[PDB]
Amino acid sequence: RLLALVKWANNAGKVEKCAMISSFLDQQAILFVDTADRLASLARDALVH
Amino acid sequence: RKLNMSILINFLDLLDILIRSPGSIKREEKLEDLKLLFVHVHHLINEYRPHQARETLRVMMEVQKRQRLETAERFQKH
């Protein structure tokens, strides 16, 4: 187990890059839907008033 | 006529300002800006209704005179 840990210790870069790339898309994903939701919310309520 | 192009151009500018800058704050001001524009069109359009309302009033005064004359002439004929 220690040998596997110390072998992966130098192989911690690509996994971090993949994780941050996935998070960026995920973080971005909340943003596009939120903008869409705001547009949807405005049509439903702002237009009526 | 001017407002229509501006909302449309902004819609098109909001489409690609997401790619030009996703993390920028200005996107939500553009939505708000869009919301402000939406507040304006309805506000400006509502200007016409009071004038429109006044026009409805004139026919009522006008139609009765068109009706009263007929009754008097009909009565005279009878």
Q: Which residues contact B6 (CB under 8 A, 6 or more apart)?
A: B37
Q: CA triplet A13, A15, A21: central angle to 5 degrees?
A: 105
Q: Can you point out the beta strands (E) in B1-78?
A: none
Contact B34, B7 (CB under 8 A): yes
Contact B40, A44 (CB under 8 A): no
- The alpha carbon of B31 is separated from its chain's Cα centroid by a whole number of angstroms, namely 22
Query: From the list A31, A38, A39, which residue is nearest B22 (CB)?
Result: A31
Interface contact A39-B42, CB threshold 8 A: no
Residue of A30, A34, A42, A48 to mutate when probing chain B, most B C-beta within 10 A:
A42
Contact A46, B39 (CB under 8 A): yes
Structure tokens that stand for B55 in this block: 């026009």
Structure tokens that stand for B20 in this block: 């030009």
The reported resolution of this PDB entry, expressed in Å, is 3.7
CA–CA distance, A8 with A13 (Å, rounded to integer): 10
Amino acid identity of residue A28, one-letter, is Q
Dihedral of CA A25/A28/A32/A33: which sign?
positive
A38 touches chain B (CB under 8 A): yes
